[PDB]
Amino acid sequence: MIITVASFKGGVGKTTTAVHLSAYLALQGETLLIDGDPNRSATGWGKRGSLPFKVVDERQAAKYAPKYQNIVIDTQARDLEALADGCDLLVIPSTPDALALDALMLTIETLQKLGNNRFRILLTIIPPYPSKDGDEARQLLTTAGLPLFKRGIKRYSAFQKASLNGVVVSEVSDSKAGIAWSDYKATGKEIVEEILT
Amino acid sequence: MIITVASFKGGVGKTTTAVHLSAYLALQGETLLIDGDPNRSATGWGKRGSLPFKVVDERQAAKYAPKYQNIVIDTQARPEDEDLEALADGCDLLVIPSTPDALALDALMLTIETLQKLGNNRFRILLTIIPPYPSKDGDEARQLLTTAGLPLFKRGIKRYSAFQKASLNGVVVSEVSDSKAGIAWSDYKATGKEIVEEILTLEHHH
Ligand SMILES: Nc1ncnc2c1ncn2[C@@H]1O[C@H](COP(=O)(O)OP(=O)(O)O)[C@@H](O)[C@H]1O
Ligand SMILES: Nc1ncnc2c1ncn2[C@@H]1O[C@H](COP(=O)(O)OP(=O)(O)O)[C@@H](O)[C@H]1O
């Protein structure tokens, strides 16, 4: 099963989602995370501590891809046609802010003329409750007839401590660990019960 | 069996070598060319006519790779860190094309020091579009690389106008309507044979 996480602006949480989406699939089958992010943030992340899946470089995609039942591809949206055709679900992370969402919206025209259940937008790094950036973003894209995940990935320190320690957030010493994981686990759940349909 | 053709400059016949190294390998198994060149010239060489192998985009490498016996990847090197270590690990041999001129070699020189760290039978350097007997760019470049200790393909690709016709009609150089179609393909045949032979020794995987 191949899912590509592809984004229109840096600092979306794209890598973090690819890592968390691969830790999810790992629980169910053997999983490769392929790193096509020019910064190779994913490879650092695996080296820095450890991770319940092999991570390899985009250049190693053809060599290692036949070995794995689950593949998560981490990459920069550069052509949105090509990413879709290479996977079962294209996940596009976006943060709630006007600047990031506009970067998403200039692309609206390609995204429409593309296919309903071929991709899906994941709102990430959502500011916590006293704040409504979350919902307002949801409505903009919904208003835009642009398919979205039931849930979003809320903003937590935990996810940072996790880049730093080179582990999945579920493993980190923070009281939002479980809640942070649960955001991704829920996304896992909907991909798998989106893609097996 | 996977080989990567990677270059350090545009206009060195990388794509052209990838396309022709694929035709070679289509001879032994079903083969995929994965186009990872931003100009996607290879994908386009495909559409223009009919090549004897399947060409996909690099975004489709994970999806398509498990269905093929042989893979050629066509990619520009692109520095960010050790893009050399891991280009070599994605393939059975990294073929690295160069023309014999000043600035092509000059780009090749930037890398010789990292290329020397790589070990000796992970890659090998193919001299391409060698100008004909009259001028001797070809042999100087070979002296240059031989002195700096880099491994090279015994033979090099000559400049034949034919390679170009092969491009515009979208067919491999032999299919082309031209007097040295043959002589130009035997160049790739020799290159291919030396690849397949290198991958298959006990030294190779040491
Ligand atoms: N849900 C989140 N909550 C808090 N911080 C996050 C979250 N997702 C990512 N980050 C942080 O944002 C920064 C950039 O994330 P990253 O995934 O690297 O973005 P990009 O995918 O665009 O590469 C990192 O320092 C990471 O710790
Ligand atoms: N051996 C050759 N003889 C004549 N022309 C060649 C040869 N190799 C490549 N060319 C020409 O050079 C042009 C571009 O080279 P290309 O193969 O696209 O280089 P690169 O892979 O680095 O892009 C092509 O139009 C092709 O006609």
PDB file of N, CA, C and O in Angstrom, chain A residues 2 4 34 36-40 57-66 71 73 75-79 81-87, chain B residues 2 4 34 36 40 57-67 71 73 75-78 80 83 85-92:
ATOM      1  N   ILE A   2       0.649   2.136  -0.952  1.00  0.00           N
ATOM      2  CA  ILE A   2       1.498   3.298  -1.104  1.00  0.00           C
ATOM      3  C   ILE A   2       0.684   4.545  -0.841  1.00  0.00           C
ATOM      4  O   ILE A   2      -0.404   4.716  -1.391  1.00  0.00           O
ATOM      5  N   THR A   4       1.590   8.689  -0.550  1.00  0.00           N
ATOM      6  CA  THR A   4       2.488   9.797  -0.679  1.00  0.00           C
ATOM      7  C   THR A   4       1.988  10.981   0.119  1.00  0.00           C
ATOM      8  O   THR A   4       0.799  11.432  -0.057  1.00  0.00           O
ATOM      9  N   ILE A  34      10.319   5.984   2.262  1.00  0.00           N
ATOM     10  CA  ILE A  34      11.168   6.688   1.266  1.00  0.00           C
ATOM     11  C   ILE A  34      11.228   8.294   1.330  1.00  0.00           C
ATOM     12  O   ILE A  34      10.220   9.037   1.250  1.00  0.00           O
ATOM     13  N   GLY A  36      12.209  11.814  -0.095  1.00  0.00           N
ATOM     14  CA  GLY A  36      12.391  12.563  -1.367  1.00  0.00           C
ATOM     15  C   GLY A  36      12.373  14.020  -1.029  1.00  0.00           C
ATOM     16  O   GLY A  36      12.031  14.863  -1.858  1.00  0.00           O
ATOM     17  N   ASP A  37      12.712  14.316   0.229  1.00  0.00           N
ATOM     18  CA  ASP A  37      12.642  15.668   0.714  1.00  0.00           C
ATOM     19  C   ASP A  37      14.074  16.131   0.576  1.00  0.00           C
ATOM     20  O   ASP A  37      14.983  15.492   1.053  1.00  0.00           O
ATOM     21  N   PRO A  38      14.294  17.221  -0.166  1.00  0.00           N
ATOM     22  CA  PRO A  38      15.652  17.625  -0.387  1.00  0.00           C
ATOM     23  C   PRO A  38      16.347  17.751   0.936  1.00  0.00           C
ATOM     24  O   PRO A  38      17.497  17.373   1.011  1.00  0.00           O
ATOM     25  N   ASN A  39      15.678  18.149   1.990  1.00  0.00           N
ATOM     26  CA  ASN A  39      16.453  18.270   3.275  1.00  0.00           C
ATOM     27  C   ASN A  39      16.734  16.956   3.954  1.00  0.00           C
ATOM     28  O   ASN A  39      17.342  16.952   5.037  1.00  0.00           O
ATOM     29  N   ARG A  40      16.246  15.850   3.421  1.00  0.00           N
ATOM     30  CA  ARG A  40      16.432  14.603   4.140  1.00  0.00           C
ATOM     31  C   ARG A  40      16.145  14.593   5.666  1.00  0.00           C
ATOM     32  O   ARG A  40      16.723  13.788   6.377  1.00  0.00           O
ATOM     33  N   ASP A  57      16.484   6.407   0.839  1.00  0.00           N
ATOM     34  CA  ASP A  57      16.540   7.614   0.164  1.00  0.00           C
ATOM     35  C   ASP A  57      15.743   7.378  -1.076  1.00  0.00           C
ATOM     36  O   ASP A  57      15.716   6.283  -1.617  1.00  0.00           O
ATOM     37  N   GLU A  58      15.151   8.411  -1.565  1.00  0.00           N
ATOM     38  CA  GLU A  58      14.440   8.366  -2.795  1.00  0.00           C
ATOM     39  C   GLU A  58      15.238   7.659  -3.860  1.00  0.00           C
ATOM     40  O   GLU A  58      14.652   7.069  -4.785  1.00  0.00           O
ATOM     41  N   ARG A  59      16.570   7.709  -3.782  1.00  0.00           N
ATOM     42  CA  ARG A  59      17.389   7.125  -4.875  1.00  0.00           C
ATOM     43  C   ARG A  59      17.382   5.629  -4.775  1.00  0.00           C
ATOM     44  O   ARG A  59      18.000   4.977  -5.613  1.00  0.00           O
ATOM     45  N   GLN A  60      16.734   5.070  -3.706  1.00  0.00           N
ATOM     46  CA  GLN A  60      16.883   3.666  -3.325  1.00  0.00           C
ATOM     47  C   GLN A  60      15.515   3.148  -3.386  1.00  0.00           C
ATOM     48  O   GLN A  60      15.171   2.042  -2.948  1.00  0.00           O
ATOM     49  N   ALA A  61      14.691   3.901  -4.075  1.00  0.00           N
ATOM     50  CA  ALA A  61      13.237   3.585  -4.014  1.00  0.00           C
ATOM     51  C   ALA A  61      13.042   2.359  -4.858  1.00  0.00           C
ATOM     52  O   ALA A  61      12.432   1.395  -4.404  1.00  0.00           O
ATOM     53  N   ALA A  62      13.712   2.309  -6.001  1.00  0.00           N
ATOM     54  CA  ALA A  62      13.441   1.188  -6.928  1.00  0.00           C
ATOM     55  C   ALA A  62      14.040  -0.095  -6.365  1.00  0.00           C
ATOM     56  O   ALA A  62      13.471  -1.145  -6.504  1.00  0.00           O
ATOM     57  N   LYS A  63      15.223   0.003  -5.777  1.00  0.00           N
ATOM     58  CA  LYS A  63      15.851  -1.157  -5.167  1.00  0.00           C
ATOM     59  C   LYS A  63      14.977  -1.674  -4.034  1.00  0.00           C
ATOM     60  O   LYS A  63      14.578  -2.801  -4.100  1.00  0.00           O
ATOM     61  N   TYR A  64      14.612  -0.865  -3.020  1.00  0.00           N
ATOM     62  CA  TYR A  64      13.925  -1.432  -1.816  1.00  0.00           C
ATOM     63  C   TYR A  64      12.401  -1.616  -1.926  1.00  0.00           C
ATOM     64  O   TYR A  64      11.850  -2.470  -1.216  1.00  0.00           O
ATOM     65  N   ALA A  65      11.718  -0.827  -2.762  1.00  0.00           N
ATOM     66  CA  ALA A  65      10.231  -0.937  -2.944  1.00  0.00           C
ATOM     67  C   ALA A  65       9.609  -2.322  -3.119  1.00  0.00           C
ATOM     68  O   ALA A  65       8.529  -2.535  -2.611  1.00  0.00           O
ATOM     69  N   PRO A  66      10.184  -3.215  -3.910  1.00  0.00           N
ATOM     70  CA  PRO A  66       9.694  -4.601  -3.970  1.00  0.00           C
ATOM     71  C   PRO A  66       9.814  -5.366  -2.659  1.00  0.00           C
ATOM     72  O   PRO A  66       9.341  -6.469  -2.594  1.00  0.00           O
ATOM     73  N   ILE A  71       4.418   1.356   1.890  1.00  0.00           N
ATOM     74  CA  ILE A  71       5.316   2.381   1.419  1.00  0.00           C
ATOM     75  C   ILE A  71       4.734   3.741   1.647  1.00  0.00           C
ATOM     76  O   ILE A  71       3.625   4.060   1.197  1.00  0.00           O
ATOM     77  N   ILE A  73       5.753   7.637   0.959  1.00  0.00           N
ATOM     78  CA  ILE A  73       6.694   8.441   0.250  1.00  0.00           C
ATOM     79  C   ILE A  73       6.622   9.889   0.764  1.00  0.00           C
ATOM     80  O   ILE A  73       5.562  10.501   0.664  1.00  0.00           O
ATOM     81  N   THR A  75       7.611  13.678   0.203  1.00  0.00           N
ATOM     82  CA  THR A  75       8.164  14.534  -0.889  1.00  0.00           C
ATOM     83  C   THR A  75       7.529  15.909  -1.096  1.00  0.00           C
ATOM     84  O   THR A  75       6.402  16.155  -0.780  1.00  0.00           O
ATOM     85  N   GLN A  76       8.246  16.779  -1.725  1.00  0.00           N
ATOM     86  CA  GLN A  76       7.819  18.166  -1.868  1.00  0.00           C
ATOM     87  C   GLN A  76       6.923  18.334  -3.092  1.00  0.00           C
ATOM     88  O   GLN A  76       7.384  17.999  -4.152  1.00  0.00           O
ATOM     89  N   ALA A  77       5.681  18.834  -3.029  1.00  0.00           N
ATOM     90  CA  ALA A  77       4.966  19.068  -4.360  1.00  0.00           C
ATOM     91  C   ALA A  77       5.768  19.996  -5.286  1.00  0.00           C
ATOM     92  O   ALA A  77       5.902  21.164  -4.971  1.00  0.00           O
ATOM     93  N   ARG A  78       6.297  19.482  -6.395  1.00  0.00           N
ATOM     94  CA  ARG A  78       7.076  20.273  -7.397  1.00  0.00           C
ATOM     95  C   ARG A  78       6.255  21.143  -8.374  1.00  0.00           C
ATOM     96  O   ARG A  78       5.644  22.154  -7.984  1.00  0.00           O
ATOM     97  N   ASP A  79       2.086  17.931 -12.934  1.00  0.00           N
ATOM     98  CA  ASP A  79       2.903  17.294 -11.831  1.00  0.00           C
ATOM     99  C   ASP A  79       2.255  16.744 -10.497  1.00  0.00           C
ATOM    100  O   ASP A  79       2.756  15.807  -9.845  1.00  0.00           O
ATOM    101  N   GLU A  81      -0.399  15.437 -11.051  1.00  0.00           N
ATOM    102  CA  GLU A  81      -0.805  14.222 -11.774  1.00  0.00           C
ATOM    103  C   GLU A  81       0.137  13.031 -11.467  1.00  0.00           C
ATOM    104  O   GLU A  81      -0.285  11.893 -11.168  1.00  0.00           O
ATOM    105  N   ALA A  82       1.433  13.303 -11.574  1.00  0.00           N
ATOM    106  CA  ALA A  82       2.449  12.275 -11.372  1.00  0.00           C
ATOM    107  C   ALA A  82       2.471  11.693  -9.941  1.00  0.00           C
ATOM    108  O   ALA A  82       2.680  10.495  -9.782  1.00  0.00           O
ATOM    109  N   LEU A  83       2.219  12.513  -8.922  1.00  0.00           N
ATOM    110  CA  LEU A  83       2.268  11.987  -7.542  1.00  0.00           C
ATOM    111  C   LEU A  83       1.151  11.021  -7.255  1.00  0.00           C
ATOM    112  O   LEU A  83       1.346  10.073  -6.441  1.00  0.00           O
ATOM    113  N   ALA A  84      -0.009  11.309  -7.857  1.00  0.00           N
ATOM    114  CA  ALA A  84      -1.249  10.581  -7.621  1.00  0.00           C
ATOM    115  C   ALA A  84      -1.071   9.283  -8.313  1.00  0.00           C
ATOM    116  O   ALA A  84      -1.255   8.214  -7.691  1.00  0.00           O
ATOM    117  N   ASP A  85      -0.686   9.339  -9.586  1.00  0.00           N
ATOM    118  CA  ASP A  85      -0.605   8.064 -10.238  1.00  0.00           C
ATOM    119  C   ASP A  85       0.331   7.095  -9.579  1.00  0.00           C
ATOM    120  O   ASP A  85       0.114   5.922  -9.754  1.00  0.00           O
ATOM    121  N   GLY A  86       1.314   7.583  -8.794  1.00  0.00           N
ATOM    122  CA  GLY A  86       2.292   6.711  -8.051  1.00  0.00           C
ATOM    123  C   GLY A  86       1.903   6.101  -6.703  1.00  0.00           C
ATOM    124  O   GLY A  86       2.756   5.453  -5.991  1.00  0.00           O
ATOM    125  N   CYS A  87       0.652   6.325  -6.283  1.00  0.00           N
ATOM    126  CA  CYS A  87       0.222   5.838  -5.003  1.00  0.00           C
ATOM    127  C   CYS A  87      -1.281   5.495  -4.955  1.00  0.00           C
ATOM    128  O   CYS A  87      -2.045   5.770  -5.917  1.00  0.00           O
TER     129      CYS A  87
ATOM    130  N   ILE B   2      19.573  -3.401 -11.679  1.00  0.00           N
ATOM    131  CA  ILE B   2      19.320  -1.966 -11.734  1.00  0.00           C
ATOM    132  C   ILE B   2      20.630  -1.250 -11.972  1.00  0.00           C
ATOM    133  O   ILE B   2      21.634  -1.458 -11.258  1.00  0.00           O
ATOM    134  N   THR B   4      21.926   2.908 -12.350  1.00  0.00           N
ATOM    135  CA  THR B   4      21.689   4.343 -12.401  1.00  0.00           C
ATOM    136  C   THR B   4      22.683   5.025 -13.337  1.00  0.00           C
ATOM    137  O   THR B   4      23.907   4.789 -13.146  1.00  0.00           O
ATOM    138  N   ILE B  34      13.060   4.613 -15.442  1.00  0.00           N
ATOM    139  CA  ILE B  34      12.458   5.545 -14.544  1.00  0.00           C
ATOM    140  C   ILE B  34      13.038   6.855 -14.856  1.00  0.00           C
ATOM    141  O   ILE B  34      14.206   7.049 -14.651  1.00  0.00           O
ATOM    142  N   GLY B  36      14.045  10.346 -13.958  1.00  0.00           N
ATOM    143  CA  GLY B  36      14.115  11.356 -12.886  1.00  0.00           C
ATOM    144  C   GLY B  36      14.825  12.642 -13.295  1.00  0.00           C
ATOM    145  O   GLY B  36      15.551  13.246 -12.486  1.00  0.00           O
ATOM    146  N   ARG B  40      12.393  15.631 -18.246  1.00  0.00           N
ATOM    147  CA  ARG B  40      11.502  14.525 -18.567  1.00  0.00           C
ATOM    148  C   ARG B  40      11.640  14.259 -20.108  1.00  0.00           C
ATOM    149  O   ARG B  40      10.663  13.932 -20.831  1.00  0.00           O
ATOM    150  N   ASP B  57       7.524   7.902 -14.570  1.00  0.00           N
ATOM    151  CA  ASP B  57       8.071   9.107 -13.986  1.00  0.00           C
ATOM    152  C   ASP B  57       8.659   8.700 -12.666  1.00  0.00           C
ATOM    153  O   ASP B  57       8.252   7.712 -12.084  1.00  0.00           O
ATOM    154  N   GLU B  58       9.645   9.410 -12.160  1.00  0.00           N
ATOM    155  CA  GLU B  58      10.211   8.987 -10.856  1.00  0.00           C
ATOM    156  C   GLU B  58       9.256   8.954  -9.651  1.00  0.00           C
ATOM    157  O   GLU B  58       9.554   8.299  -8.638  1.00  0.00           O
ATOM    158  N   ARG B  59       8.147   9.682  -9.717  1.00  0.00           N
ATOM    159  CA  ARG B  59       7.116   9.622  -8.664  1.00  0.00           C
ATOM    160  C   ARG B  59       6.454   8.259  -8.654  1.00  0.00           C
ATOM    161  O   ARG B  59       5.831   7.915  -7.658  1.00  0.00           O
ATOM    162  N   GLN B  60       6.572   7.523  -9.776  1.00  0.00           N
ATOM    163  CA  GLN B  60       6.025   6.161  -9.934  1.00  0.00           C
ATOM    164  C   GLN B  60       7.042   4.991  -9.753  1.00  0.00           C
ATOM    165  O   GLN B  60       6.733   3.814  -9.913  1.00  0.00           O
ATOM    166  N   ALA B  61       8.244   5.330  -9.379  1.00  0.00           N
ATOM    167  CA  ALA B  61       9.249   4.318  -9.121  1.00  0.00           C
ATOM    168  C   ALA B  61       8.839   3.322  -8.092  1.00  0.00           C
ATOM    169  O   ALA B  61       8.982   2.164  -8.377  1.00  0.00           O
ATOM    170  N   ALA B  62       8.304   3.714  -6.937  1.00  0.00           N
ATOM    171  CA  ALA B  62       7.840   2.680  -5.953  1.00  0.00           C
ATOM    172  C   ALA B  62       6.740   1.762  -6.481  1.00  0.00           C
ATOM    173  O   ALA B  62       6.667   0.596  -6.109  1.00  0.00           O
ATOM    174  N   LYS B  63       5.849   2.305  -7.308  1.00  0.00           N
ATOM    175  CA  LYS B  63       4.639   1.618  -7.711  1.00  0.00           C
ATOM    176  C   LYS B  63       5.028   0.580  -8.729  1.00  0.00           C
ATOM    177  O   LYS B  63       4.728  -0.594  -8.550  1.00  0.00           O
ATOM    178  N   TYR B  64       5.762   1.026  -9.752  1.00  0.00           N
ATOM    179  CA  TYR B  64       6.221   0.204 -10.895  1.00  0.00           C
ATOM    180  C   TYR B  64       7.450  -0.685 -10.766  1.00  0.00           C
ATOM    181  O   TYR B  64       7.582  -1.604 -11.565  1.00  0.00           O
ATOM    182  N   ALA B  65       8.337  -0.443  -9.796  1.00  0.00           N
ATOM    183  CA  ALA B  65       9.628  -1.116  -9.763  1.00  0.00           C
ATOM    184  C   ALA B  65       9.510  -2.618  -9.491  1.00  0.00           C
ATOM    185  O   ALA B  65      10.318  -3.394  -9.997  1.00  0.00           O
ATOM    186  N   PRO B  66       8.519  -3.062  -8.718  1.00  0.00           N
ATOM    187  CA  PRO B  66       8.491  -4.467  -8.351  1.00  0.00           C
ATOM    188  C   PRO B  66       7.993  -5.322  -9.482  1.00  0.00           C
ATOM    189  O   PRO B  66       8.149  -6.535  -9.473  1.00  0.00           O
ATOM    190  N   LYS B  67       7.441  -4.700 -10.495  1.00  0.00           N
ATOM    191  CA  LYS B  67       6.978  -5.494 -11.623  1.00  0.00           C
ATOM    192  C   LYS B  67       8.048  -5.683 -12.710  1.00  0.00           C
ATOM    193  O   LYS B  67       7.721  -6.307 -13.726  1.00  0.00           O
ATOM    194  N   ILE B  71      15.965  -2.490 -14.146  1.00  0.00           N
ATOM    195  CA  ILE B  71      15.596  -1.054 -14.021  1.00  0.00           C
ATOM    196  C   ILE B  71      16.785  -0.203 -14.433  1.00  0.00           C
ATOM    197  O   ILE B  71      17.895  -0.437 -13.927  1.00  0.00           O
ATOM    198  N   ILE B  73      17.562   3.919 -14.181  1.00  0.00           N
ATOM    199  CA  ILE B  73      17.073   5.170 -13.613  1.00  0.00           C
ATOM    200  C   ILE B  73      17.843   6.252 -14.320  1.00  0.00           C
ATOM    201  O   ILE B  73      19.062   6.160 -14.335  1.00  0.00           O
ATOM    202  N   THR B  75      18.789  10.081 -13.937  1.00  0.00           N
ATOM    203  CA  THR B  75      18.722  11.175 -12.965  1.00  0.00           C
ATOM    204  C   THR B  75      19.919  12.134 -13.020  1.00  0.00           C
ATOM    205  O   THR B  75      21.026  11.735 -13.201  1.00  0.00           O
ATOM    206  N   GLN B  76      19.702  13.391 -12.765  1.00  0.00           N
ATOM    207  CA  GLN B  76      20.810  14.281 -12.622  1.00  0.00           C
ATOM    208  C   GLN B  76      21.352  14.065 -11.151  1.00  0.00           C
ATOM    209  O   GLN B  76      20.600  13.896 -10.220  1.00  0.00           O
ATOM    210  N   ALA B  77      22.649  13.990 -10.970  1.00  0.00           N
ATOM    211  CA  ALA B  77      23.257  13.874  -9.609  1.00  0.00           C
ATOM    212  C   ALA B  77      22.736  14.839  -8.567  1.00  0.00           C
ATOM    213  O   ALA B  77      22.295  14.411  -7.518  1.00  0.00           O
ATOM    214  N   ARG B  78      22.783  16.131  -8.781  1.00  0.00           N
ATOM    215  CA  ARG B  78      22.237  17.008  -7.688  1.00  0.00           C
ATOM    216  C   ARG B  78      22.864  16.955  -6.248  1.00  0.00           C
ATOM    217  O   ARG B  78      22.388  16.183  -5.419  1.00  0.00           O
ATOM    218  N   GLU B  80      23.571  17.601  -2.381  1.00  0.00           N
ATOM    219  CA  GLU B  80      23.089  18.278  -1.196  1.00  0.00           C
ATOM    220  C   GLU B  80      24.031  17.803  -0.062  1.00  0.00           C
ATOM    221  O   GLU B  80      24.432  18.643   0.795  1.00  0.00           O
ATOM    222  N   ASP B  83      24.944  12.783  -1.854  1.00  0.00           N
ATOM    223  CA  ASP B  83      24.117  12.190  -2.885  1.00  0.00           C
ATOM    224  C   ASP B  83      24.853  11.014  -3.702  1.00  0.00           C
ATOM    225  O   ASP B  83      24.143  10.064  -4.230  1.00  0.00           O
ATOM    226  N   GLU B  85      27.072   8.499  -2.084  1.00  0.00           N
ATOM    227  CA  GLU B  85      26.861   7.226  -1.337  1.00  0.00           C
ATOM    228  C   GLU B  85      25.564   6.535  -1.683  1.00  0.00           C
ATOM    229  O   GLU B  85      25.540   5.363  -2.042  1.00  0.00           O
ATOM    230  N   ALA B  86      24.453   7.244  -1.538  1.00  0.00           N
ATOM    231  CA  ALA B  86      23.199   6.605  -1.737  1.00  0.00           C
ATOM    232  C   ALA B  86      22.813   6.513  -3.174  1.00  0.00           C
ATOM    233  O   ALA B  86      22.053   5.622  -3.433  1.00  0.00           O
ATOM    234  N   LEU B  87      23.314   7.320  -4.136  1.00  0.00           N
ATOM    235  CA  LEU B  87      23.006   6.929  -5.538  1.00  0.00           C
ATOM    236  C   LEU B  87      23.581   5.529  -5.801  1.00  0.00           C
ATOM    237  O   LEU B  87      22.937   4.710  -6.524  1.00  0.00           O
ATOM    238  N   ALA B  88      24.770   5.236  -5.233  1.00  0.00           N
ATOM    239  CA  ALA B  88      25.396   3.961  -5.497  1.00  0.00           C
ATOM    240  C   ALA B  88      24.629   2.861  -4.839  1.00  0.00           C
ATOM    241  O   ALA B  88      24.704   1.752  -5.330  1.00  0.00           O
ATOM    242  N   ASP B  89      23.834   3.128  -3.794  1.00  0.00           N
ATOM    243  CA  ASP B  89      23.209   2.015  -3.082  1.00  0.00           C
ATOM    244  C   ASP B  89      21.919   1.615  -3.650  1.00  0.00           C
ATOM    245  O   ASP B  89      21.512   0.497  -3.487  1.00  0.00           O
ATOM    246  N   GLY B  90      21.274   2.523  -4.364  1.00  0.00           N
ATOM    247  CA  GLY B  90      20.131   2.161  -5.142  1.00  0.00           C
ATOM    248  C   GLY B  90      20.413   1.366  -6.398  1.00  0.00           C
ATOM    249  O   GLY B  90      19.460   1.018  -7.103  1.00  0.00           O
ATOM    250  N   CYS B  91      21.661   1.105  -6.783  1.00  0.00           N
ATOM    251  CA  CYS B  91      21.792   0.327  -7.964  1.00  0.00           C
ATOM    252  C   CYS B  91      22.911  -0.661  -7.979  1.00  0.00           C
ATOM    253  O   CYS B  91      23.829  -0.563  -7.215  1.00  0.00           O
ATOM    254  N   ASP B  92      22.829  -1.614  -8.884  1.00  0.00           N
ATOM    255  CA  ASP B  92      23.897  -2.559  -9.125  1.00  0.00           C
ATOM    256  C   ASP B  92      25.245  -1.974  -9.636  1.00  0.00           C
ATOM    257  O   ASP B  92      26.266  -2.534  -9.283  1.00  0.00           O
TER     258      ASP B  92
END
